[PDB]
Design an enzyme around this catalytic site. Structure first.
Site, PDB file in Angstrom:
ATOM      1  N   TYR B 509       0.919  -1.135   0.000  1.00 47.61           N
ATOM      2  CA  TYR B 509       0.000   0.000   0.000  1.00 47.61           C
ATOM      3  C   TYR B 509       0.959   1.185   0.000  1.00 47.61           C
ATOM      4  O   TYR B 509       1.123   1.853  -1.012  1.00 47.61           O
ATOM      5  CB  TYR B 509      -0.919   0.026   1.227  1.00 47.61           C
ATOM      6  CG  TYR B 509      -1.875   1.173   1.105  1.00 47.61           C
ATOM      7  CD1 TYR B 509      -1.670   2.347   1.821  1.00 47.61           C
ATOM      8  CD2 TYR B 509      -2.911   1.145   0.158  1.00 47.61           C
ATOM      9  CE1 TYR B 509      -2.447   3.456   1.605  1.00 47.61           C
ATOM     10  CE2 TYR B 509      -3.705   2.270  -0.071  1.00 47.61           C
ATOM     11  CZ  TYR B 509      -3.457   3.425   0.664  1.00 47.61           C
ATOM     12  OH  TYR B 509      -4.187   4.571   0.451  1.00 47.61           O
ATOM     13  N   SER B 592      -5.187   0.884  -4.962  1.00 48.01           N
ATOM     14  CA  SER B 592      -5.190   2.313  -4.649  1.00 48.01           C
ATOM     15  C   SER B 592      -3.774   2.883  -4.660  1.00 48.01           C
ATOM     16  O   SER B 592      -3.073   2.789  -5.661  1.00 48.01           O
ATOM     17  CB  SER B 592      -5.843   2.537  -3.275  1.00 48.01           C
ATOM     18  OG  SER B 592      -6.096   3.909  -3.043  1.00 48.01           O
ATOM     19  N   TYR B 593      -3.356   3.457  -3.549  1.00 42.35           N
ATOM     20  CA  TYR B 593      -1.989   3.962  -3.495  1.00 42.35           C
ATOM     21  C   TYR B 593      -1.087   2.771  -3.734  1.00 42.35           C
ATOM     22  O   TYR B 593      -0.005   2.883  -4.297  1.00 42.35           O
ATOM     23  CB  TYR B 593      -1.648   4.619  -2.135  1.00 42.35           C
ATOM     24  CG  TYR B 593      -0.448   5.565  -2.177  1.00 42.35           C
ATOM     25  CD1 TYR B 593       0.858   5.083  -2.207  1.00 42.35           C
ATOM     26  CD2 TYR B 593      -0.635   6.950  -2.180  1.00 42.35           C
ATOM     27  CE1 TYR B 593       1.962   5.952  -2.236  1.00 42.35           C
ATOM     28  CE2 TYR B 593       0.452   7.833  -2.210  1.00 42.35           C
ATOM     29  CZ  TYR B 593       1.753   7.325  -2.239  1.00 42.35           C
ATOM     30  OH  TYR B 593       2.840   8.186  -2.262  1.00 42.35           O
ATOM     31  N   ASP B 670     -15.572   4.069 -10.757  1.00 37.64           N
ATOM     32  CA  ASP B 670     -14.733   4.526  -9.654  1.00 37.64           C
ATOM     33  C   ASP B 670     -14.791   6.060  -9.641  1.00 37.64           C
ATOM     34  O   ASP B 670     -14.233   6.724 -10.515  1.00 37.64           O
ATOM     35  CB  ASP B 670     -13.287   4.052  -9.868  1.00 37.64           C
ATOM     36  CG  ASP B 670     -12.446   4.098  -8.592  1.00 37.64           C
ATOM     37  OD1 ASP B 670     -12.560   5.061  -7.795  1.00 37.64           O
ATOM     38  OD2 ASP B 670     -11.644   3.168  -8.399  1.00 37.64           O
ATOM     39  N   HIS B 702     -14.273   2.220  -6.478  1.00 38.04           N
ATOM     40  CA  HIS B 702     -12.948   1.977  -5.933  1.00 38.04           C
ATOM     41  C   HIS B 702     -12.854   0.746  -5.029  1.00 38.04           C
ATOM     42  O   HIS B 702     -11.767   0.194  -4.844  1.00 38.04           O
ATOM     43  CB  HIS B 702     -12.447   3.219  -5.181  1.00 38.04           C
ATOM     44  CG  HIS B 702     -10.960   3.260  -5.011  1.00 38.04           C
ATOM     45  ND1 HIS B 702     -10.084   3.163  -6.077  1.00 38.04           N
ATOM     46  CD2 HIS B 702     -10.184   3.397  -3.907  1.00 38.04           C
ATOM     47  CE1 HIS B 702      -8.843   3.239  -5.637  1.00 38.04           C
ATOM     48  NE2 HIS B 702      -8.876   3.382  -4.320  1.00 38.04           N
TER      49      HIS B 702
END
Ligand SMILES: CN(C)C(=O)[C@@H]([C@H]1CC[C@H](c2ccc3ncnn3c2)CC1)[C@H](N)C(=O)N1CCC(F)(F)C1
Ligand SMILES: CN(C)C(=O)[C@@H]([C@H]1CC[C@H](c2ccc3ncnn3c2)CC1)[C@H](N)C(=O)N1CCC(F)(F)C1
Ligand SMILES: *[C@@H]1O[C@H](CO)[C@@H](O[C@@H]2O[C@H](CO)[C@@H](O)[C@H](O)[C@H]2NC(C)=O)[C@H](O)[C@H]1NC(C)=O
Ligand SMILES: *[C@@H]1O[C@H](CO)[C@@H](O[C@@H]2O[C@H](CO)[C@@H](O)[C@H](O)[C@H]2NC(C)=O)[C@H](O)[C@H]1NC(C)=O
Ligand SMILES: *[C@@H]1O[C@H](CO)[C@@H](O[C@@H]2O[C@H](CO)[C@@H](O)[C@H](O)[C@H]2NC(C)=O)[C@H](O)[C@H]1NC(C)=O
Ligand SMILES: *[C@@H]1O[C@H](CO)[C@@H](O[C@@H]2O[C@H](CO)[C@@H](O)[C@H](O)[C@H]2NC(C)=O)[C@H](O)[C@H]1NC(C)=O
Ligand SMILES: *[C@@H]1O[C@H](CO)[C@@H](O[C@@H]2O[C@H](CO)[C@@H](O)[C@H](O)[C@H]2NC(C)=O)[C@H](O)[C@H]1NC(C)=O
Ligand SMILES: *[C@@H]1O[C@H](CO)[C@@H](O[C@H]2O[C@H](CO)[C@@H](O)[C@H](O)[C@H]2NC(C)=O)[C@H](O)[C@H]1NC(C)=O
Ligand SMILES: *[C@@H]1O[C@H](CO)[C@@H](O[C@H]2O[C@H](CO)[C@@H](O)[C@H](O)[C@H]2NC(C)=O)[C@H](O)[C@H]1NC(C)=O
Ligand SMILES: *[C@H]1O[C@H](CO)[C@@H](O[C@@H]2O[C@H](CO)[C@@H](O)[C@H](O)[C@H]2NC(C)=O)[C@H](O)[C@H]1NC(C)=O
Ligand SMILES: *[C@H]1O[C@H](CO)[C@@H](O[C@@H]2O[C@H](CO)[C@@H](O)[C@H](O)[C@H]2NC(C)=O)[C@H](O)[C@H]1NC(C)=O
Ligand SMILES: *[C@@H]1O[C@H](CO)[C@@H](O)[C@H](O)[C@H]1NC(C)=O
Ligand SMILES: *[C@@H]1O[C@H](CO)[C@@H](O)[C@H](O)[C@H]1NC(C)=O
Ligand SMILES: *[C@@H]1O[C@H](CO)[C@@H](O)[C@H](O)[C@H]1NC(C)=O
Ligand SMILES: *[C@@H]1O[C@H](CO)[C@@H](O)[C@H](O)[C@H]1NC(C)=O
Ligand SMILES: *[C@@H]1O[C@H](CO)[C@@H](O)[C@H](O)[C@H]1NC(C)=O
Ligand SMILES: *[C@@H]1O[C@H](CO)[C@@H](O)[C@H](O)[C@H]1NC(C)=O
Ligand code: NA
Lengths: 728, 728
Positions: B509, B592-593, B670, B702
């Site tokens: 992450y 995500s990140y 998203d 998302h």
């Protein structure tokens, strides 16, 4: 020791077919671009002269996309700043160069962002459309006259077609038709006011922070359609002090009773124009023949000169009512129509007589009428050797229909079985373009005695190169189903050995009136799969395919997603029963309509296919446009054909995909078969827990033809097929 | 042989983790749902009674999604027709049930499509937002009073947050705050008039013919932000005046000089409210403390009560400035802030004195303040054993700071090292929630003597089931890099053997203040991968990670896409050197990140990883929102940090992806990390001729959390990983 035809060869165009694209400018000469130079050729002797230096515009400063010389050879239109829109539409900037005074015109120049431009058929008048309005220039350097003032982006279209009319009816952006000598300029006007908009994202270059939303008036099946009106204007009586007056020609009452379409416009003479109208229920069309009246300055269309064309088994025409070919005096005309046996043949019509007379007949079909003189009518048909996938040029004596002469059949039967033709202005000469089964061959001929003057291009260079390559072969044959023969073709690997089991890829399209089994020579993906991977690539024309009569073509009327899908499975089933096919390795793939059939097949539960690839497929007919969909499916209302619209979707077969490997591909900027169709397929597969492969192409449309995307898709599909077939 | 934890076990949730969610309704009673009925428990003795029989609403005519009892226990709010929006927002219908009369109120009902509703903290007043305007009901059956008339869909938001404030600032949809006894109602008003819209298609069910275009005011980095205003209305005056005045409280001059945000609202007393403001350049925040002026009915914030909180090494707060906890009399407050060493500790403030006094200190950090009584302050920290990944509850005597007792550390040290807590209304009792490293354990305790009252849920049922399963083991440890500790965890296959070479999957992450190495017990995808596939799943917290001081957290200030990416690569190397890892089979994946870091790593050309999976990744910071992005990257302009913005994109590393196997996945709906981000990654890869795997999830956001999609994406990712590792 020689190499094979590889994927890189296909992608980088290592083996290029040479062509000979000429442009007839009279009955004796034609223009041909060579070495970037434009030469003028004399057909009789073959001698030429330079017409335009490939250096004349060295300091033009703009990249010239294309050019267009005025009919009188006095001017040349230079096209640049080309920006593609849909399949045929685009905008561009133009400049007119004076050939006489070898000078570029700088006064009163055509506007930038012009949507369409065309020289008059004779002389050098111009007609262009800008901002949805029509303009006319009598002279290249003089100010233009505004013909229309109602033009409105995405709402009112004057002289150009909206999305659906461009794609499905005219196959062109223009909706302008000059009379034979340039006097009159006829045009259509489209109103999309109430047509819903299809909306999708366009991402553009990475520098664009917010995605753009593209909006296009696109009528899906059952939705509100654009309306149309037809006008005619006299370009010889235009005033700089008064707004041009356009005369309207309304459609017949049998058309005005409900939704309808303008499907054809063809001039008969300097003062007579014909128009064909089609009802939204595409089984009934009407041709109106209109004459100019010098007394009132109006156009009258005598009811006695009306011609109705209807169909009881399907729709009218192959994709639309055929165009009429008028005689010199415009008093009679020839038109291809379905006869009582369901075969398309040429019928001869008198403008004021209801009954027409068929001049050709038989269990084959005329593809198109190519030229007409007082003594002969020239046409292309698939009559020769009864091969529906072959095409030849014939001429029929108008004074005695029993006298039909094939003009291309015997020129070179082994190499040439599929011809196309281009006649000079008065049909004094014609260019024959053979495209298969051997390498393309272009020849020039004279009509008076059908002499073969000379060979324009024989592709001997490519023939020499291909000698060092292990090229696949092509088998064209048929199988019988219920007393009816259906044709297929197979691209066989080099040194084909019928004692071995080869994997087999079924390449399918199968849309209505389609033909995938023919005698055409092609260098494509299949060439590589057969040459390098030793995969047999086959195609089959089943029920619904064209050029074999209405009994076959109309079998799927109001029933898409049925017989044409079942027939592909049946064909595969039969191929799998052949000694040289490995029944454990049979795949299927298609693009567009072909994506739909491939998906319906894989979701059929037939168990015949191990894997399949669907590219930009249609998934449910309510998502596709009205003009094409309704032609074959009627309307999606409970009173008409909704039940079948709902039973012919890919989504309903999701569960059956559990036993196959499926790759679904689609460009996000597809304005034709919306990404939506694939988004609904993937969601249905997810909903029943079926795993599959997918690939979206950012900003690519239905053609996925940008250079990088093209290479990427075929590369990705090759890995998938090889993996499915356990090929290194 | 004991079975293993399979993919189906995870996707089907066969091993269910039990929990104990209670709702305190007073200082010694809480509600708990058992057998679908609502029970009320006496904290002190553990005895209970049926509060609401499960059949009470068997004929309500709707499925009740959730309920809420007014603070005085006289009414119950029934929520139904739940329609989810973003992470926290949703719309719903509501009915009110009179608990005493046992009747459902049928008059002056809360409108359908109500955006937010909340009882007053005392009594049973109600405030709700409908059509973007605030309404107040003094009594459940009487007419409501409208408070605002400016409400405007996607433009003016009163009492509710817009997209960016909901997601990045308040982590809630509501933007209204009742004063302690309910007299005043404070609220924010957001204006998105000039905020650009993100637009994307939503396909919905197959029956929708035309796709829907979703449009959301969303400010990308450097774009126009929404502006905000704050107001307070006196609800006790609503039935006395026709239109009660909303008194505005303006932001300080230090904020009005430029773009700013409202980042915290916290009431101190019945007549004192505190608000914190933050400059668009997020390293300077101001807290105003405002008192009600009974003579003018106005709100005044004395500058001598203003508190400044700025940061020299990075931004302010972990994700936003921390909230204050006021003492009963409202004259002082405790707040977590970064000390001189960069560690976040509790600072005690006098409201009119600028210097505060830290009451805790050390090389560890306070996670949060959980409760405050006249004698003690309870908080959660990772002090115990110096484990930044552990969490324990502490009590500090307000009259003697040297007196600090850990209330959870020693309860069951082997089984419990990660606690969260829930205090009763006046903190008379508290429920401890142990979430790892062993099975979750829920216990109730008495605050008067810190004695355990009993176990609420020990997960014995699950422990029994896991006995017959070959569960993986988890290791939490650290490595020293540059003389500083960096923690990591490894999910180890059953019967792990350090003498073998195991394939390794780096689960990443790594966004700012993230923590992937902890003592929490999880049953997830990694469990299956280790248990069934014998894959080691590791995670590492490098520069940029949180709860370890600003030195590490702010290391990536203005530099996203650098150190946190390299440390992840360096972690894989370090793991290689451990000897039980197969250097030929090292993969990486993140969401995500995490998807961003994964992509950056796969495109670094390090040669360390074989393949990787990026799910809903960020690809370029200019596509993400302003509040989050600018906090760490500043502004994307030449005068600020544009060069790094342009240097940290995934697209610029496209060429390096030729060295690895990549699977890119993204939901088309998203609203957070726009599909646009992966659409640009794929295009960039197609543009350089890189083959890769892709998968879009129609209409998923998302979270790709719908039941079918969830099972589908993890199944798809399993095949990819197993194939990359050559696993059967
Ligand atoms: C095979 N091709 C290129 C076509 O069928 C397209 C059109 C090509 C031009 C034809 C057309 C129109 C007028 C005319 N007049 C003479 N020939 N002729 C041909 C109509 C169909 C069709 N609109 C299309 O793009 N589809 C994608 C989804 C689908 F598969 F479902 C149909
Ligand atoms: C880890 N999570 C869930 C987050 O970072 C999200 C947010 C969760 C809530 C946080 C937030 C806000 C106020 C607050 N007050 C106290 N804690 N706290 C936390 C902010 C970040 C973030 N908005 C997001 O969705 N991103 C996707 C792209 C990205 F990775 F780049 C960031
Ligand atoms: C094109 O055809 C039109 C129509 O026949 C010609 O226009 C007519 O010309 C005659 C002779 O000059 C006039 O008496 C008529 O009044 C004209 N009719 C109309 C409608 O204009 C025109 O001359 C022809 N143009 C060319 C270049 O041959
Ligand atoms: C839990 O049990 C206790 C008794 O063990 C209950 O106590 C009652 O409390 C009320 C006041 O609320 C007194 O008037 C009664 O006399 C008490 N009864 C007894 C037997 O002591 C308590 O009500 C119970 N709570 C719940 C939620 O069931
Ligand atoms: C929300 O902000 C906008 C400005 O972005 C305000 O709109 C302006 O209002 C003034 C005053 O009436 C007008 O003169 C301008 O024409 C408006 N500008 C724009 C861009 O619309 C709007 O009033 C604000 N709304 C509220 C409730 O505060
Ligand atoms: C209640 O008071 C508010 C505040 O004055 C009124 O809102 C104003 O309404 C007028 C005219 O409708 C506008 O010109 C102002 O811009 C509004 N101001 C604000 C802050 O919204 C509201 O209309 C009043 N409601 C009633 C029923 O009188
Ligand atoms: C809640 O707090 C408010 C504000 O302190 C109380 O209202 C005040 O009550 C006093 C009397 O004690 C009056 O002198 C003021 O005029 C009131 N102020 C305002 C702004 O109304 C209110 O009474 C408290 N509510 C309860 C239930 O105690
Ligand atoms: C092709 O050759 C002919 C001669 O064989 C060229 O000449 C014809 O046209 C010339 C000018 O247009 C005249 O000068 C000649 O008299 C005429 N020939 C005859 C027999 O009349 C002709 O122009 C050449 N065409 C090209 C395109 O170069
Ligand atoms: C284009 O079509 C529209 C609609 O079919 C024509 O406008 C008509 O329909 C409107 C509905 O949007 C009505 O409100 C109008 O009263 C009606 N007539 C007019 C003049 O708007 C519109 O006129 C057409 N435009 C042209 C140039 O033909
Ligand atoms: C269409 O656009 C072109 C390009 O802008 C116009 O040509 C000139 O372009 C130069 C710069 O290349 C500008 O400085 C001029 O303003 C443009 N106009 C002229 C007259 O020089 C061209 O003129 C445009 N065509 C029309 C019909 O407006
Ligand atoms: C062309 O096809 C249409 C559609 O099949 C025919 O219209 C009618 O279709 C409905 C079903 O939608 C049937 O119930 C009718 O029997 C059909 N005929 C009529 C007159 O309504 C239409 O008849 C066909 N046209 C021709 C000339 O054959
Ligand atoms: C015209 O330009 C092209 C540029 O590619 C050049 O190759 C060609 O030789 C030129 N034509 C002549 C006749 O020189
Ligand atoms: C022509 O018609 C347009 C649109 O109705 C009008 O604006 C213009 O003034 C007219 N010009 C003349 C000369 O009538
Ligand atoms: C004949 O064959 C067709 C397919 O070619 C099939 O659909 C039909 O049922 C068969 N029987 C008859 C009577 O046509
Ligand atoms: C509460 O309702 C459930 C059904 O959801 C039922 O099983 C149970 O018996 C009811 N409660 C009691 C105490 O019986
Ligand atoms: C909510 O909507 C339903 C269905 O449209 C309607 O019957 C009901 O009366 C509405 N309730 C309120 C409070 O408006
Ligand atoms: C706040 O951050 C900006 C951007 O780096 C910087 O220029 C300014 O000096 C900072 N202020 C403080 C107090 O650190
Ligand atoms: Na010859």
């Amino acid at each position: 020791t020689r190499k094979t035809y590889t994927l890189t060869d296909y992608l980088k165009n290592t083996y290029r077919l040479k062509l000979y694209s000429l442009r007839w400018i009279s009955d004796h000469e034609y223009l041909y671009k060579q070495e970037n130079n434009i030469l003028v050729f004399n057909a009789e002797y073959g001698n030429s002269s330079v017409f335009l230096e490939n250096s004349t515009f060295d300091e033009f400063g703009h990249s010239i996309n294309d050019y267009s010389i005025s009919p009188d050879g006095q001017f040349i239109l230079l096209e640049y700043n080309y920006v593609k829109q849909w399949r045929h539409s685009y905008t561009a900037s133009y400049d007119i160069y004076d050939l006489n005074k070898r000078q570029l015109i700088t006064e009163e120049r055509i506007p930038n962002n012009t949507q369409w431009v065309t020289w008059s058929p004779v002389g050098h008048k111009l007609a262009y459309v800008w901002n949805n309005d029509i303009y006319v220039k009598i002279e290249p350097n003089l100010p233009s006259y505004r013909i229309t003032w109602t033009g409105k982006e995405d709402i009112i279209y004057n002289g150009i077609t909206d999305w659906v009319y461009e794609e499905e009816v005219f196959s062109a952006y223009s909706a302008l038709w000059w009379s034979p000598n340039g006097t009159f300029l006829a045009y259509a006007q489209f109103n999309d006011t109430e047509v819903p908009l299809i909306e999708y994202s366009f991402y553009s270059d990475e520098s664009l922070q917010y995605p753009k939303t593209v909006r296009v008036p696109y009528p899906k099946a059952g939705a509100v359609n654009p309306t149309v009106k037809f006008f005619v204007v006299n370009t010889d009586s235009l005033s700089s002090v008064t707004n041009a007056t356009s005369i309207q020609i309304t459609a017949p009452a049998s058309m005005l009773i409900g939704d309808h379409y303008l499907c054809d416009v063809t001039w008969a003479t300097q003062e007579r124009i014909s128009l064909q109208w089609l009802r939204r229920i595409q089984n009934y069309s009407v041709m109106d023949i209109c004459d100019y009246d010098e007394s009132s300055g109006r156009w009258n269309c005598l009811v006695a000169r009306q011609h109705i064309e209807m169909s009881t088994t399907g729709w009218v025409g192959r994709f639309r009512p055929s165009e009429p070919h008028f005689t010199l005096d415009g008093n009679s005309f020839y038109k291809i129509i379905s006869n009582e046996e369901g075969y398309r043949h040429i019928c001869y019509f008198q403008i004021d007589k209801k009954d027409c007379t068929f001049i050709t007949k038989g269990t084959w079909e005329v593809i198109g009428i190519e030229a007409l003189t007082s003594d002969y009518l020239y046409y292309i048909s698939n009559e020769y050797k009864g091969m529906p996938g072959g095409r030849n040029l014939y001429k029929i004596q108008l004074s005695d229909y029993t006298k039909v002469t094939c003009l291309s059949c015997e020129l070179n039967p082994e190499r040439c079985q599929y011809y196309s033709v281009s006649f000079s202005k008065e049909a004094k000469y014609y260019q024959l373009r053979c495209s298969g089964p051997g390498l393309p061959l272009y020849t020039l001929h004279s009509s008076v005695n059908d002499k073969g003057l000379r060979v324009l291009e024989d592709n001997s260079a490519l023939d020499k190169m291909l000698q060092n390559v292990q090229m696949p072969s092509k088998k064209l044959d048929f199988i019988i189903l219920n007393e009816t023969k259906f044709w297929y073709q197979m691209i066989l690997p080099p040194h084909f050995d019928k004692s071995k089991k080869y994997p087999l890829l079924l390449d399918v399209y199968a849309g209505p009136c389609s033909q995938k089994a023919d005698t055409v020579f092609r260098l494509n993906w299949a060439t590589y799969l057969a040459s390098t991977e030793n995969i047999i690539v086959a195609s089959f024309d089943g029920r619904g395919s064209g050029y074999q009569g209405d009994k076959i073509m109309h079998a799927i009327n109001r029933r898409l997603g049925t017989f044409e899908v079942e027939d592909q499975i049946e064909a595969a089933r039969q191929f799998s029963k052949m000694g040289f096919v490995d029944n454990k390795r049979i795949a299927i793939w298609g693009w567009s309509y072909g994506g739909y059939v491939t998906s319906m097949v894989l979701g059929s539960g037939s168990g015949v296919f191990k894997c399949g690839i669907a590219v930009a497929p249609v998934s449910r007919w309510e998502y596709y446009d009205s003009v094409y969909t309704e032609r074959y499916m009627g309307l999606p209302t409970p009173e008409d054909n909704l039940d079948h619209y709902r039973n012919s979707t890919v989504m309903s077969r999701a569960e059956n995909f559990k036993q196959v490997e499926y790759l679904l591909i689609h460009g996000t900027a597809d304005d034709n078969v919306h990404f939506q169709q694939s988004a609904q397929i993937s969601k249905a597969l997810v909903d029943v827990g079926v795993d599959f492969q997918a690939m979206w192409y950012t900003d690519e449309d239905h053609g996925i033809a940008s250079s990088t995307a093209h290479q990427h898709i075929y590369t990705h599909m090759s890995h998938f097929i090889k993996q499915c077939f356990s090929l290194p």
